[PDB]
């Protein structure tokens, strides 16, 4: 009944939002098990195992990242429930591939202000 959760955020794209990712994961742990807590081959394979196990995939999509985009594309194809979180105050324009993938139900993209992330997650998960 408590969901398994998969979190996505930029790493090699840049760690600008690392503190925010820690806040997101701390809040997700209140609701479920966060599965995400060659060398790169092991990372890919283990992440893909967890992605298929996840009940919800949550991605912070403000910092551009190949790996986050790839995770989202694989997740869509696995028909996962997906929540993407984007901060327009960053001054970026979110990728059309992510904004345009939203169908408002199984794949949602929410624009938000950084201070409100915990409350937003509360509204989505309760």
Ligand X SMILES: O=c1[nH]c(=O)n([C@@H]2O[C@H](COP(=O)(O)O)[C@@H](O)[C@H]2O)cc1CO
Helix (H, G, I), strand (E, B), or coil: what is residue 59?
strand
**By CB neighbour count within 10 A (0-12 exposed, 13-18 middle, 19+ buried), where does 97 fall?**
exposed
- Whether 51 and 6 have beta carbons less than 8 Å apart is answered as yes
Q: Supply the minimum distance, in Å, between the C-beta of residue 28 and ligand X.
A: 13
9 is in the binding site of which of ligand X, a copy of itself, none (Cβ under 5 to 8 A by kind)?
A: ligand X
Nearer to ligand X, 1 or 81 (CB): 81
User: Interface residues with a copy of itself (CB under 8 A)?
Assistant: 10-14, 38-45, 47, 61, 64-78, 92-102
Nearer to ligand X, 58 or 122 (CB): 58
Nearer to a copy of itself, 14 or 26 (CB): 14
Between CA 74 and CA 52 the distance in angstroms is 9
Between CA 121 and CA 83 the distance in angstroms is 10
Q: Supply the minimum distance, in Å, between the C-beta of residue 125 and a copy of itself.
A: 23
Is 67 annotated as a binding-site member? yes
């Amino acid at each position: 009944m408590r969901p398994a959760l998969y979190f996505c955020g930029s790493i090699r794209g840049g760690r600008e939002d690392r503190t925010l990712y820690e806040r997101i994961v701390s809040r997700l742990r209140r609701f479920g098990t966060v599965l995400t807590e060659g060398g790169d081959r092991l990372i890919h394979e283990q992440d893909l195992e967890w992605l298929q196990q996840a009940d919800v995939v949550v991605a912070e999509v403000t910092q551009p990242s190949l790996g986050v985009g790839y995770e989202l594309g694989r997740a869509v194809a696995f028909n996962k429930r997906i929540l993407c979180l984007f901060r327009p105050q960053s001054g970026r324009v979110l990728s059309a591939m992510i904004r345009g993938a939203a169908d408002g139900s199984r794949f949602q993209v929410w624009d938000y202000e950084e201070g409100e992330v915990e409350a937003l997650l509360d509204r989505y998960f309760e």
